[PDB]
Design an enzyme around this catalytic site. Structure first.
Site, PDB file in Angstrom:
ATOM      1  N   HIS A   6       2.219  47.281 -18.032  1.00  0.00           N
ATOM      2  CA  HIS A   6       1.019  47.530 -17.680  1.00  0.00           C
ATOM      3  C   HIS A   6       1.429  46.842 -15.820  1.00  0.00           C
ATOM      4  O   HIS A   6       1.802  45.943 -15.921  1.00  0.00           O
ATOM      5  CB  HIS A   6       0.334  46.510 -18.092  1.00  0.00           C
ATOM      6  CG  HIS A   6       0.307  45.419 -18.968  1.00  0.00           C
ATOM      7  ND1 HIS A   6      -0.129  44.319 -17.472  1.00  0.00           N
ATOM      8  CD2 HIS A   6       0.603  44.626 -19.508  1.00  0.00           C
ATOM      9  CE1 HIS A   6      -0.851  43.144 -17.982  1.00  0.00           C
ATOM     10  NE2 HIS A   6       0.079  43.414 -18.840  1.00  0.00           N
ATOM     11  N   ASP A  37       4.145  37.909 -16.837  1.00  0.00           N
ATOM     12  CA  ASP A  37       3.284  39.228 -17.585  1.00  0.00           C
ATOM     13  C   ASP A  37       2.390  40.006 -16.604  1.00  0.00           C
ATOM     14  O   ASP A  37       1.597  39.940 -15.479  1.00  0.00           O
ATOM     15  CB  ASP A  37       1.823  38.324 -18.299  1.00  0.00           C
ATOM     16  CG  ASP A  37       0.925  39.029 -19.144  1.00  0.00           C
ATOM     17  OD1 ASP A  37       1.604  40.521 -18.625  1.00  0.00           O
ATOM     18  OD2 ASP A  37      -0.303  38.777 -19.033  1.00  0.00           O
ATOM     19  N   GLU A  87      -4.783  46.834 -18.514  1.00  0.00           N
ATOM     20  CA  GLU A  87      -4.467  46.083 -20.201  1.00  0.00           C
ATOM     21  C   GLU A  87      -5.419  44.988 -20.451  1.00  0.00           C
ATOM     22  O   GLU A  87      -5.495  44.072 -21.054  1.00  0.00           O
ATOM     23  CB  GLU A  87      -2.846  46.005 -19.885  1.00  0.00           C
ATOM     24  CG  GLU A  87      -2.273  45.512 -21.777  1.00  0.00           C
ATOM     25  CD  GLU A  87      -2.621  43.639 -21.242  1.00  0.00           C
ATOM     26  OE1 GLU A  87      -2.404  43.087 -20.541  1.00  0.00           O
ATOM     27  OE2 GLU A  87      -3.123  43.281 -22.699  1.00  0.00           O
ATOM     28  N   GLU A  95       5.918  42.728 -22.702  1.00  0.00           N
ATOM     29  CA  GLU A  95       4.935  40.975 -22.459  1.00  0.00           C
ATOM     30  C   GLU A  95       6.057  40.250 -22.891  1.00  0.00           C
ATOM     31  O   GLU A  95       6.720  40.663 -22.951  1.00  0.00           O
ATOM     32  CB  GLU A  95       3.647  42.076 -23.715  1.00  0.00           C
ATOM     33  CG  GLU A  95       2.565  42.449 -23.773  1.00  0.00           C
ATOM     34  CD  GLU A  95       2.256  42.393 -22.501  1.00  0.00           C
ATOM     35  OE1 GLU A  95       1.119  43.036 -22.318  1.00  0.00           O
ATOM     36  OE2 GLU A  95       2.152  41.429 -22.123  1.00  0.00           O
TER      37      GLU A  95
END
EC number: 3.5.1.-
Lengths: 360, 360
Positions: free
Chosen positions: B73, B104, B131, B156
């Site tokens: 993402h 992240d 996300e 992640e």
């Protein structure tokens, strides 16, 4: 129905209401404004205006050798939300008037001034300006003078009935802080556990009674903490209060509430405490109540039920004076948008105080 | 320590970080910006950019006939408070980089692009942009295409270890309204009683276990109600969430939580629900987990412990794909001020994906 005494009361009330005495911010001065007005409307009275500072101002007026003292606070709570018109411009309908403070409690001040101008009977008035918020100074300062009076009548809306007892009051600010060292990680979870214990305790006191009053009125009025649903809240603010019955151990109650926080609250601050009316041991409370009842009877005032709200009559009573609460209007309108008081109530109250002061 | 692959990863990461992809407000366009950059950095790939609307954009790139799909993402959470410098200007120290999304999870995107430019091995990338918040559209839309893949690796921060399982997630908005018809008069007292019941229930589930994960992570993250300490609060807002273990009955859990409100909450809204990884009956969950373990082994990825945080790998898994979570960095830095990821982590991850894609 209209009378000259009522008409005069309404004229004075319109003026009193026009003076901004909202508290907060309590921007009240000793010079000018409402106190200058009252000084000019008390013929035959020896008048003294004391500036206690920061908006706490008192006007003590005495005419002759009165045996009773009438105390009326001149400050009002803030206005709105939802007022339909200027709160400082008294409006009138067929049976009532609307304005900030007409019910709590400028209506009483207006009536007392009208009575002061309708005859030269002995009278003692103590107008204060700090009853509606914290940091009060007026009454404490007056009590320090040790001036004799058989009784003190404190004005608050009691529908023109003499109220001899009422609850005490306490307000507290609590702050919970997360303990990242853990089931106490969340300040909100801590607040939840504290609250459950506090409410359970309140329930355990439901059978306590005094003058028709039952239990401990308790209220968690504000909770503000956290940011997002799944984010652990590191802090939370909680504000609560309670209104003890006379003779209840308030110190013990406060400690009990504080002890329900495990771990200890990061902050526990009692922002205000007012005694019940009367206060002290149950024996003293009943003796004081009966004394107030005898005064009400001597003044021909109909006795009303004990109330849940707080008044400074509690301060005079704790100071050694027989005290009672007496004023026009209903507490139901106090602090409300478009606050009002009926002409019927104003009429009943002014006729009563005029009788006490100027009657044969 | 520096390598050409790491140097390229850092160059791409600096660029990716410079693109504002904060969500909210998710002001992400299909044309220009980050997607235009990625389109220009994927040689040999058949590329498609789909605008799902309102900031939900996907870029599906395929080179050759890859058996695995890498999903990353591109949106980040909002910045601050407390960032010591521009969050969109990647900074570098001796052993790490600092910037919004470096951990992240733009670091993974940068590494995958570097690998794409270091060899012509088969590869399939799915970059999404929704996300981090509600109203996701990217993955659901991709799943509707029923494209075959032996496994899907969702990026992640997992410290470069293959994670095969994680908790589900639920977020709820509750509104309590006072009942002036009374022990339920206060919305805050109602919230307090609800909270006590909810926490007690959570405690009763403390023994549930899965992959080292224990109990139900539950969190009341926001409570906002009332105005003053002694004023009855007519309304109160409460936001809470929980993270179920795989196989837990989430529908039943939600109803249980809602039923703890007596009277019923004026509003009870589950704002988001994400499945656990894997999801379904315990038998299915274990079978799916083992399948992911076999894929990790085949790809020579070290297996990490199941995590508490949520990822969209859960969506691919519920859709029928064997799925796992894999990315550089630690969740501890995710969503934090001065978010960072070590060069060591970036190096380990990029070498691993380059091996998967371009290795012999």
């Amino acid at each position: 129905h209209m009378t000259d005494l009522l008409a005069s009361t309404l004229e004075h009330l319109e003026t009193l209401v026009s003076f901004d005495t909202r508290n907060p911010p309590r921007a009240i001065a000793a010079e000018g404004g409402i106190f200058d007005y009252l000084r000019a409307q008390l013929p035959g009275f020896q008048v003294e205006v004391i500036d206690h500072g920061d908006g706490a101002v008192s006007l003590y007026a005495v005419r002759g050798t009165p045996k009773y003292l009438f105390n009326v606070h001149l400050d009002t709570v803030p206005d709105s939300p939802h007022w339909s018109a200027d709160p400082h411009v008294m409006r009138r309908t067929e049976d009532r008037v609307i304005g900030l403070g007409v019910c709590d409690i400028k209506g009483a001040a207006a009536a007392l001034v009208a009575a002061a101008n309708a005859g030269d009977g002995d009278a003692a008035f103590l107008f204060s300006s700090d009853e509606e918020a914290n940091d009060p100074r007026c009454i404490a300062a007056f009590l320090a003078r040790g001036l004799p009076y058989d009784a003190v009548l404190v004005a608050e809306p009691t529908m023109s009935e003499a109220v001899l007892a009422h609850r005490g009051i306490s307000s507290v600010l609590m702050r919970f802080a997360g303990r990242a060292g853990d089931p106490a990680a969340s300040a909100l979870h801590q607040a939840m556990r504290w609250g459950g214990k506090a409410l359970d305790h309140v329930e355990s006191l439901a059978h306590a009674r005094f003058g028709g009053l039952t239990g401990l009125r308790f209220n968690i009025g504000r909770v503000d903490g956290g940011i997002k649903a799944n984010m652990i809240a590191p802090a939370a603010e909680l504000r609560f209060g309670f209104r003890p019955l006379p003779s209840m151990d308030v110190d013990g109650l406060l400690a009990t509430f504080a002890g329900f926080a495990d771990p200890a609250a990061a902050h526990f601050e009692e922002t205000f405490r007012g005694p019940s009316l009367p206060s002290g041991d149950i024996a003293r409370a009943e003796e004081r109540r009966l004394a107030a009842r005898d005064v009400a009877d001597a003044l021909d005032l109909p006795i009303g039920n004990a109330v849940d709200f707080w008044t400074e009559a509690s301060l005079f009573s704790a100071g050694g004076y027989t005290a009672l609460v007496y004023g026009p209007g209903d507490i139901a309108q106090a602090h409300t948008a478009d606050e009002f008081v009926t002409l019927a109530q104003l009429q009943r109250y002014v006729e009563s105080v005029n009788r006490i002061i100027n009657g044969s």
